Design a protein around this ligand. Structure first.
Ligand SMILES: CCc1c(C(=O)NCc2c(O)ccc3cccc(O)c23)[nH]c(C)c1C(C)=O
Length: 119
């Protein structure tokens, strides 16, 4: 469409926060994603050489709380950025990679009816 529907901040928050909470509820799968990757603490100094645009659950939560999303696709894009970052950097045998794959399955399931409700 050429006429982008306007979403109120609280409309986006009420619709989308339950899908973020569904990711947070995955335990242990969400544990590596609840805070930004700290490459120095984690002993992986090559991280920012590979991941140019970091993203995590706490950043997305803050963006939802502060009205930084004007439409739901922006929120979906940030969640997918988090996923694609983990699938890019981590080896396929690693816990973070397999945990990412589980979160993406959960997010796909939860986000579909919500995007239909938002129109
Ligand atoms: C591997 C480092 C890393 C974490 C992380 O936080 N590792 C430390 C960690 C925890 O802080 C809590 C639970 C973990 C459960 C398994 C493996 C971990 O490592 C875990 N999160 C992301 C997105 C990455 C990368 C590079 O993509």
């Amino acid at each position: 469409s050429m006429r982008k529907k306007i979403f109120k901040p609280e409309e986006l928050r009420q619709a989308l926060m339950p899908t973020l909470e569904a990711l947070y509820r995955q335990d242990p799968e969400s544990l590596p994603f609840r805070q930004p990757v700290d490459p120095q603490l984690l002993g992986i100094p090559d991280y920012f050489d590979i991941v140019k645009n970091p993203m995590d659950l706490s950043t997305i939560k803050r963006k939802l709380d502060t009205g930084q999303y004007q439409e739901p696709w922006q929120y979906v894009d940030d969640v997918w950025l988090m996923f694609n970052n983990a699938w890019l950097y981590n080896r396929k045998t690693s816990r973070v990679y397999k945990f990412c794959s589980k979160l993406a399955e959960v997010f796909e399931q939860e986000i579909d009816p919500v995007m239909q409700s938002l129109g």
